């Protein structure tokens, strides 16, 4: 994977000694080239993960996330061009360095071989985002935002470290290939429950899970837009990639202690989706929407069925493209109106034709029209959960109905209706943010044509 | 300010007869019933002491409150009508014209020429009207939303632009 790693780190010298105006052009073009090179990673064998090196390996689960990160990186590059114009060149290059460093840690995380190496770069993503959230934020609270996001993830991260090093002393290795191949049943000894626990809350705190999610509304609604997408699109999914990994050994414990988190989640998305319907800030809805969508994933991983894992993977990638779009969409409105209140700028279809479309299928992908990959992930979860328990259907079915309730609500309360006559600064929609939405949406329908590439290794 | 005694009955009499024609439907039937209630309205036109008319108010307003049709005829442009707030999806604020690419402005040259002088007309008018409104307003601010006239020389009516440049009721 150094055919991706080496060019990615080579973006640092190139972006750090380019001209004072070419930093945006240079970073965007070669990051896209990295995305094209990363597209070759879509190739997967029947069941053998691509073992490029001793310390790097990939399969049908890592690559779709890998392409998601690499494809994403130019998207914040173009999104940040708007509000980063009024800055010095050296600080601007510092911003680009954080994004590239964030990307580089992401690729190493997904391509990691053993759990400890995965853990190091996994957590290492906290540092670049911590600077992004805090240094370049917009409001006073961002200082409290960073601490909330940092400690929450760390509070669960440290128990996993103790459990991980404990794995090495007991099993003899932490390599994922050996762990799955040398998998042994886990006893129900009272120590083993905490052993199971210490490998879980690390992944579910950043999912986020119901209860342990408050950093999500306190960061995504408050981070800079560029940091907002990568947080929602991929960073939450870091728990997903880990959980499919760590569950290979933590069996058959999952049968019992999934329950306290299952209905914690099962009552979760319905509860969270209710909060989304009754927000006042724009970005607060999508943030609360993200945990709601992430909640069905938690059930998908934990239930441990092949169908749910495919549904987990599809919903994971689909939500990333979606949540990035709505966060980008909110940023476009926030920039002109200098706020994020929902009913502040209702009724803008008459002035924003193309935006009103970009609202339209972005919300529809949030409603998950058929046959968008959102349903393909969502429906697979439903069938797996129903096979587990019939009474499941009412809950998340009601959730995706209250999900439908709000997912038109901002469409009504941002585009439908009459403009505000005192507002007179909604200028012609610039092609930059405009083309940004195009690059968000077309891969969604393109992947809809051939979804078979994003169901993970269980397909 | 407060709704005067004979003003409140005029409001109640208004929709009560609209309720009547909603009930009667037929024009002649409405005409017969409207005149009957006209004399009924005139039965105690005298009130003398205001306390009597307040009691007469209560019975009267209670009559027309129950006098509503279950589905009264709300006109298409009436509040809640079929055509009410229908074409708001077409009207766009006048400032959007300034946010036009020069090609579109050039291909509508005469209109933007007269829009420019209208934009100019807004300038001196706004200048004159604000230094007209500040002293026309007595201490304690404006006692009511009524706004003073252009009673000076060569002066435009203060606070006129959005009223004059209102989105025309038929934007098409």
């Amino acid at each position: 994977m150094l055919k991706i790693i080496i060019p990615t780190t080579m973006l640092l010298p190139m972006t750090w000694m380019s001209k004072h105006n070419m930093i945006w052009i240079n970073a965007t073009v070669h990051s896209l080239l990295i995305s094209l090179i990363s597209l070759s990673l879509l190739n997967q064998l029947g069941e053998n993960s691509l073992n490029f090196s001793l310390t790097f390996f990939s399969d049908s689960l890592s690559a779709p996330l890998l392409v998601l990160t690499t494809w994403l990186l130019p998207l914040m590059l173009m999104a940040s061009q708007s509000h980063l114009s009024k800055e010095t060149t050296t600080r601007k290059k510092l911003y680009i360095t954080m994004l590239i460093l964030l990307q580089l840690f992401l690729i190493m995380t997904f391509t990691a071989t053993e759990l400890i190496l995965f853990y190091i770069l996994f957590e290492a993503t906290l540092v670049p985002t911590l600077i992004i959230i805090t240094r370049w934020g917009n409001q006073t609270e961002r200082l409290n935002a960073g601490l909330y996001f940092l400690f929450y993830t760390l509070a669960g991260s440290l128990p996993l470290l103790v459990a991980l090093v404990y794995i090495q002393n007991t099993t003899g290795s932490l390599n994922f290939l050996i762990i799955h191949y040398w998998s042994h049943p886990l006893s129900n000894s009272w120590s083993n429950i905490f052993m199971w626990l210490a490998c879980i809350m690390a992944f579910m705190v950043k999912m986020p899970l119901y209860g342990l999610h408050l950093w999500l509304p306190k960061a995504h609604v408050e981070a800079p837009i560029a940091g907002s997408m990568v947080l929602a699109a991929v960073l939450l999914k870091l728990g997903g990639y880990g959980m499919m990994r760590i569950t290979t050994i933590l069996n058959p414990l999952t049968n019992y202690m999934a329950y306290p988190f299952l209905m914690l989640s099962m009552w979760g998305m319905i509860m969270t989706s209710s909060i989304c319907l009754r927000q006042t800030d724009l970005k607060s809805l999508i943030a609360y929407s993200s945990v709601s969508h992430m909640a069905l994933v938690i059930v998908a991983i934990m239930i441990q069925t092949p169908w749910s894992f495919m549904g987990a993977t599809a919903l994971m990638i689909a939500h990333g493209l979606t949540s990035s779009m709505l966060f980008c969409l909110a940023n476009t409105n926030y920039e002109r109106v200098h706020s994020r209140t929902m009913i502040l700028a209702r009724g803008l279809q008459t002035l924003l034709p193309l935006m009103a479309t970009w609202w339209l299928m972005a919300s529809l992908t949030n409603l998950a029209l058929p046959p968008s990959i959102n349903l393909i992930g969502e429906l697979f979860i439903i069938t797996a959960s129903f096979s587990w328990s019939n009474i499941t259907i009412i809950l998340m079915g009601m959730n995706m109905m209250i999900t439908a309730l709000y997912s038109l609500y901002m469409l009504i309360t941002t585009q439908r209706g009459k403009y505000t006559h005192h507002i007179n600064n909604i200028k012609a929609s610039f092609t930059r943010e405009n083309a940004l939405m195009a690059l968000h949406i077309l891969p969604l329908l393109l992947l809809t044509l051939n979804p078979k590439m994003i169901l993970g290794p269980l397909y | 300010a407060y709704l005067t005694h004979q003003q409140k009955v005029l409001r109640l009499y208004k929709r009560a007869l609209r309720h009547l024609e909603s009930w009667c439907v037929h024009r002649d039937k409405y005409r017969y019933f409207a005149c009957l209630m006209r004399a009924r309205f005139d039965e105690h036109k005298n009130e003398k002491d205001m306390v009597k008319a307040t009691q007469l108010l209560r019975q009267a307003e209670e009559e027309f409150w129950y006098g509503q049709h279950p589905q009264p005829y709300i006109f298409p442009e009436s509040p809640g009508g079929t055509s009410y707030e229908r074409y708001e999806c077409y009207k766009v604020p006048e400032w959007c014209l300034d946010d036009w690419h020069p090609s579109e402005k050039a291909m509508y040259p005469d209109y933007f020429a007269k829009r420019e002088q209208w934009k100019r007309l807004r300038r001196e008018s706004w200048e004159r009207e604000v230094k007209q409104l500040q002293e026309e307003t007595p201490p304690g601010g404006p006692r009511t939303e009524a706004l003073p006239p252009a009673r000076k020389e060569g002066d435009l009516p203060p606070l006129w632009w959005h009223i004059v440049t209102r989105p025309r009721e038929r934007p098409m």
Binding site: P353 | W100, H101, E104, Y111, R170, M172
Partner: peptide, 12 residues
């Protein structure tokens, strides 16, 4: 006759 119709600048 023809009135004036007002629209956002769709050239972009």
């Amino acid at each position: 006759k023809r009135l004036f119709i007002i629209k956002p600048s769709g050239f972009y």
